[PDB]
Design a protein around this ligand. Sequence first.
Ligand code: NDP
Ligand code: CP6
Length: 217
Amino acid sequence: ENLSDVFDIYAICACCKVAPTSEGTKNEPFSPRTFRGLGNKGTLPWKCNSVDMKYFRSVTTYVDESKYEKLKWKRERYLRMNADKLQNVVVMGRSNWESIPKQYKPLPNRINVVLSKTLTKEDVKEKVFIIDSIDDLLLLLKKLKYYKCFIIGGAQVYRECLSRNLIKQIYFTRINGAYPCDVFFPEFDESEFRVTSVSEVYNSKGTTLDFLVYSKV
Ligand SMILES: NC(=O)C1=CN([C@@H]2O[C@H](COP(=O)(O)OP(=O)(O)OC[C@H]3O[C@@H](n4cnc5c(N)ncnc54)[C@H](OP(=O)(O)O)[C@@H]3O)[C@@H](O)[C@H]2O)C=CC1
Ligand SMILES: CCc1nc(N)nc(N)c1-c1ccc(Cl)cc1
């Protein structure tokens, strides 16, 4: 009855502290969420961060063949009632797909999926599934051999999956720095997600950061 568990749908993101503004109705100097800044002008708020990229890459790439068996059965039973290299699935919005550096798209060692009702195969020469909605993602997953399904961006992609309770875990990176932002991470029922992993602190050129993991418990 839990699709996020049956199809191992997780979410991964990186958020920073929002940089204040002296004009407008959007300045929150006492926000209860110190880390809510997701993007700024179609780009990352902090630009580049070697550690986070390394972490994100590792996480969304790692596969354990010695664990797929259990997963295959879990999905077979559900479906009831192709010798393809085992890989994870990454799901992104059109913007995110259009920002990836040419030499990184499609994401290496990963099955890429882009949510869009505008793009077409004719215009994208790279291998990647294009879907109209989350419902189509579900369909795709029901008939696709993969390890885990990672949602990597952006705002609305995250917001629809949460509200539809399709998220088993959340990989949350906390960038410790203030940056101007215009896109933020959506809010969710914190109560149904308990923090199950708290990493040590890390440093990326004076900018500290850490990695958390919440599990729908
Ligand atoms: N720090 C982090 O971890 C992350 C940061 N970001 C940042 O976020 C900003 C991008 O934000 P945003 O424009 O929201 O990004 P998206 O990548 O979601 O692009 C929006 C577009 O994606 C499509 N889309 C989004 N949701 C859906 C949906 N539910 N169904 C179908 N299509 C959908 C639409 O395409 P169409 O119009 O073709 O239908 C849409 O107009 C950037 O600055 C990026 O760097 C993004 C992810 C993670
Ligand atoms: C390395 C950035 C990064 N770090 C973390 N922690 N989570 C993410 N989801 C992304 C990310 C954002 C946009 C694209 Cl297009 C690909 C990945």
